[PDB]
Design a protein around this ligand. Structure first.
Ligand SMILES: Nc1ncnc2c1ncn2[C@@H]1O[C@H](COP(=O)(O)OP(=O)(O)NP(=O)(O)O)[C@@H](O)[C@H]1O
Ligand SMILES: CC(=O)Nc1ccc(-c2csc(N)n2)cc1
Ligand SMILES: [Mg+2]
Ligand code: NA
Length: 418
């Protein structure tokens, strides 16, 4: 059986099944992505397209990227050239057959791109209504990760698009945090999300610097702003371990398209492991045994037989041999690509962008620098519990909310009861 939707969650589902285009929003861990899964399960699969702004986020809901669905290249070309690309075989059919378009993590989509997609929808489907008449089902949190751009200009938030409100006329909120169980931590995260670091908030985050978050042989994943820093840390730490290297080579359906696969898949072509390697499980294997996406462990052995698969001891307690898994990604024009590989990544470090949408339970972050709006909040709001979090050098300068977003939220709630 499945969990009981809150009243707020049920209201969103009601709107969607009435055919209403909607944006629904809420703090980290309010069940937005979970509700998207329930929505997709309640709709006919024909005519329903599941996307997210990013590859990492698309994985959480079993969807494709909005880039891959649109098939307009980067979206930087002139509109007429974007339309021509959208008319290509397979791409075109995707636009024509789409009756309902789901988009998670809307906060990373910039307004100029939204405008472009809206216009492409109209041109390709030859329907002179907002977004070509597609029912839009959009969610995310504009106080989380900010918009990116394939161009060179400062991006606008998606809600700045002159078509935003016309395309998503209804807005609902999820207000009950589920990810964290502890009210103290929930209240602390809410203050951070709104950029309200009181002396008490700042004191509580600084106190985490003393947290021992690692257990026997497992150490915290450091969350970093940039993948360069992640790659160098994981490689240096692996190198310093004394054991022999064990290698696991992925099998791809189209090796020549590996880079397309890489954008939408959490595992690498070449996985290298040693005794003592710090690893993250990047696929749900068994919710019951705590073997879920984000679970942290350490390699404690390799099997003597066959491929010599790794034995991994996880923080929760279970020790388990990790077998091959498989990811099938939906690329442009409905093309499918697959990768077979062990569902493990090295995890002495991880980028904040790769943690988007995830729950983690053994994390360290240094928060003494200016960050992107919403980025400090995303990093802190991944942790299930205050005790799996160690913040170093915390300073409220790290915590920034874009004034455009505070103004958006205030306008949104203007007529509401609370
Ligand atoms: N009705 C519910 N009752 C209990 N737990 C729930 C409910 N809805 C969602 N959850 C749990 O809440 C946790 C967070 O859900 P998730 O869908 O990741 O939230 P989110 O709002 O998408 N998070 P984020 O992407 O970080 O903003 C998951 O462990 C869900 O199982
Ligand atoms: C689509 C995609 O690229 N996903 C993804 C998710 C998580 C990670 C990860 C976990 S620990 C680490 N160093 N990296 C890598 C990749
Ligand atoms: Mg989510
Ligand atoms: Na990847």
């Amino acid at each position: 059986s499945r969990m009981q939707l809150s009243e707020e969650q049920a209201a969103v589902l009601r709107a969607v099944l009435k055919g209403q285009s909607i944006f629904f929003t809420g703090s980290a861990g309010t069940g937005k992505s979970y509700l998207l899964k329930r929505i997709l399960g309640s709709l006919p699969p024909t005519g329903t397209v599941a996307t997210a702004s990013t590859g990492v986020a698309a994985c959480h809901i079993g969807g494709t990227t909005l880039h891959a669905f649109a098939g307009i290249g980067s979206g930087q070309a002139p509109l007429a050239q974007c339309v021509a690309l959208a008319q290509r075989p397979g791409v075109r059919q995707g636009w024509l057959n789409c009756q309902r378009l789901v988009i998670d993590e809307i906060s990373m989509v910039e307004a100029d791109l939204f405008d472009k997609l809206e216009a492409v929808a109209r041109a390709v489907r030859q329907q002179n209504k907002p977004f070509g008449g597609i029912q839009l089902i959009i969610c995310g949190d504009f106080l989380q990760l900010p918009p990116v751009t394939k161009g060179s200009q400062p991006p606008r938030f998606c809600f700045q698009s002159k078509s935003w409100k016309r395309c998503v006329p209804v807005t609902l909120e999820l207000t009950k945090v589920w990810r964290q169980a502890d009210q103290t931590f929930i209240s602390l995260l809410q203050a951070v999300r709104l950029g309200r670091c009181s002396d008490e908030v700042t004191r509580q985050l600084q106190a985490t610097a003393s947290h021992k978050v690692g257990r026997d042989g497992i150490v915290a994943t450091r969350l970093c702003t940039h993948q360069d820093d992640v790659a160098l840390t994981n490689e240096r730490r692996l190198q310093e371990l004394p054991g022999k290297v064990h290698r696991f080579e992925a099998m791809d359906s189209n090796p020549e398209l590996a880079s397309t696969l890489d954008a939408q898949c959490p595992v690498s072509q070449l996985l290298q492991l040693k005794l003592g390697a710090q690893v993250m499980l990047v696929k749900n294997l068994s919710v019951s045994r705590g073997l879920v996406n984000g679970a942290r462990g350490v390699v404690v052995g390799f099997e003597a037989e066959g491929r010599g698969l790794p034995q991994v001891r996880f923080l929760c307690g279970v020790t388990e041999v990790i077998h091959a898994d498989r990811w099938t990604v939906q690329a442009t024009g409905g093309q499918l690509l697959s990768r077979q590989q062990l569902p493990l990544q090295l995890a002495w470090a991880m980028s904040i962008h790769k943690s988007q949408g995830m729950t983690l339970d053994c994390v360290e972050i240094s928060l003494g620098r200016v960050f992107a709006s919403g980025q400090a909040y995303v990093a802190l709001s991944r942790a299930r519990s205050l005790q799996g979090l160690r913040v170093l050098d915390f300073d409220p300068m790290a915590v920034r909310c874009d004034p455009r977003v505070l103004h958006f939220y205030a306008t949104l709630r203007r007529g509401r009861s609370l």
